[PDB]
UniProtKB/Swiss-Prot annotation, chains A, B:
Enzyme class per UniProt: oxidoreductase
Name of the protein: Quinate/shikimate dehydrogenase (NAD(+))
Swiss-Prot/TrEMBL induction comment: By shikimate, quinate and QsuR.
Catalytic reactions of this protein: L-quinate + NAD(+) = 3-dehydroquinate + NADH + H(+); shikimate + NAD(+) = 3-dehydroshikimate + NADH + H(+)
Annotated GO CC locations: cytosol
Annotated GO MF terms: NAD+ binding; NADP binding; quinate 3-dehydrogenase (NAD+) activity; shikimate 3-dehydrogenase (NAD+) activity; shikimate 3-dehydrogenase (NADP+) activity
Origin organism lineage: Bacteria, Bacillati, Actinomycetota, Actinomycetes, Mycobacteriales
Record pathway: Metabolic intermediate biosynthesis; chorismate biosynthesis; chorismate from D-erythrose 4-phosphate and phosphoenolpyruvate: step 4/7; Aromatic compound metabolism; 3,4-dihydroxybenzoate biosynthesis; 3-dehydroquinate from D-quinate (NAD(+) route)
Residues at the catalytic site: 72
Natural source organism: Corynebacterium glutamicum (strain ATCC 13032 / DSM 20300 / JCM 1318 / BCRC 11384 / CCUG 27702 / LMG 3730 / NBRC 12168 / NCIMB 10025 / NRRL B-2784 / 534)
Amino acid sequence: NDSILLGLIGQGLDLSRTPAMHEAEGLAQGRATVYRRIDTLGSRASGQDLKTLLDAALYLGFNGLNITHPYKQAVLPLLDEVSEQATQLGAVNTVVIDATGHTTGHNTDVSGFGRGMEEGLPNAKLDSVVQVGAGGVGNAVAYALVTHGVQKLQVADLDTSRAQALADVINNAVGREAVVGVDARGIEDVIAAADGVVNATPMGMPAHPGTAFDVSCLTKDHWVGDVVYMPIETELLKAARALGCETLDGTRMAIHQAVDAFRLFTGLEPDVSRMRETFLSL
Amino acid sequence: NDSILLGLIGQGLDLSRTPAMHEAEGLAQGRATVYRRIDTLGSRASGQDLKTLLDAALYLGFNGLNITHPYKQAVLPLLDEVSEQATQLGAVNTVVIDATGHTTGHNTDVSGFGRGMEEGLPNAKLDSVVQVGAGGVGNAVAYALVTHGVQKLQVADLDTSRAQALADVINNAVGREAVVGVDARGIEDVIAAADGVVNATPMGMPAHPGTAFDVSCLTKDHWVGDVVYMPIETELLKAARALGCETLDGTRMAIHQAVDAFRLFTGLEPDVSRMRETFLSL
Ligand SMILES: NC(=O)c1ccc[n+]([C@@H]2O[C@H](COP(=O)([O-])OP(=O)(O)OC[C@H]3O[C@@H](n4cnc5c(N)ncnc54)[C@H](O)[C@@H]3O)[C@@H](O)[C@H]2O)c1
Ligand SMILES: NC(=O)c1ccc[n+]([C@@H]2O[C@H](COP(=O)([O-])OP(=O)(O)OC[C@H]3O[C@@H](n4cnc5c(N)ncnc54)[C@H](O)[C@@H]3O)[C@@H](O)[C@H]2O)c1
């Protein structure tokens, strides 16, 4: 029944649903919980280096942090220890801070997305999958996919440097040639031949309306995932549903990254349904 | 219903009752509240300067701090603004942090002790009072006394430099010669002639058993106060009670400094009875 102190270091955090999820679940477990935005574009932490903010959290009794863009790679060398998976991906989103200020990095984007696939696509065929988008979120998603039984993942990005760098990182992490960079041009025919496809681009968001590829390449037998969670039903997922495809919406990763982080931070077993209800209520 | 984040910068804080008081009252008002020790002898904040710790609180979203020994004077020049009373005493125990990291210093030791006198000694005669002890707590107590209608306060300390420096500070703060330093040797006869006496020394504590002066100098007509709050009934207050004297125990200031700080930090009206019950429960 000791109180819990957490925060998120990142940029442009006002609309994040992560603080609310953690504050509600700590309270539901009888533990007063504060989860603060630490926004380097905002009114308190502007102009401060990542190491200053991390050090501050240590000194003033935080039990953990999340880390988001543009800090998930930069944070690694600052930490005392880093999980195998976070090390091999080269990205940390969760920092557990023990009673002395010792830090351990983890990656709950990877574990989160993996859990979403178990929960939402238990019967999906995983032999051949396409992922469109090789940014930050895409890096974690690809890792999750190929450690969760995807045999061959083809990753396309408008920026070829990003897709190949992704492939190299993941293949090293898993010890086999699981991932292949492919061209974005003509991606539809690649998708058509695969078992499933995941959008890991901004397409579908209000400010990026549409889809990353022509949905006419989908068939009823495909499964389709999307990282975008606002709106939950993206134009891509609506097209997929219209055909009868199984779909994996973006709220599953979003919720599970927080479930997994709360467990890491506190040692408590989070209630997934309550954290899901918090998320959807915002 | 925004969560509240507070802490205490000081040394040797494990047994402080202040965190528990604030965490309980925030929760009773429907506001998840974390109040962290920031102990420069402890496992997280050792070796760090006061300015580093204050800055850290700003960056990571604290709504306020308390400040205790040896930092209540040192903190003043670090703050953006300081209350009249805290300025004139030269000591701050409460720092309100607004939404940008702007800081205002206050002194709730002074307001606390004053409120205790109103609550616990409403009918006391205040023409002539003696205070034994001119350290930190004594400085706040003396200020409270002479702004709350004490005409002449005689302050004794084994260290004469401390009693005279106190007198000079307070007399400047209040604009009259309210306080006079007197010798500790022979203080009993000075007490005997006065209306009331306040112990502001460590005497009475478990590790400092006894009294700061011979209690035989007391009469039934005196009132007697003590800053020591463990034990609540000090040897001094037991002697005073034996004669039928009105007494002011040290828990009143301790509780009220926290009541007044919580009001400052949050804008909420604290429930004195609940914060008193938290204090006594520890
Ligand atoms: N569900 C969640 O938990 C969660 C969390 C954070 C972000 N997101 C979502 O993930 C999206 C991606 O985030 P990110 O941080 O990796 O963004 P990013 O901008 O770093 O990466 C997106 C990648 O998509 C590529 N891309 C864009 N359009 C493309 C197209 N038509 N074809 C192929 N590649 C294309 C870009 O070149 C870029 O490399 C965000 O826009 C947001 O909607 C979801
Ligand atoms: N009620 C509260 O809210 C509260 C809060 C903090 C501390 N305290 C109590 O206040 C006490 C004093 O704290 P402080 O920080 O000012 O301590 P301090 O040690 O800075 O000052 C105490 C002063 O007492 C003087 N003194 C000691 N014995 C004396 C004697 N026999 N005659 C005359 N002077 C004597 C010392 O020379 C010293 O200047 C603490 O020991 C603690 O019990 C109470």
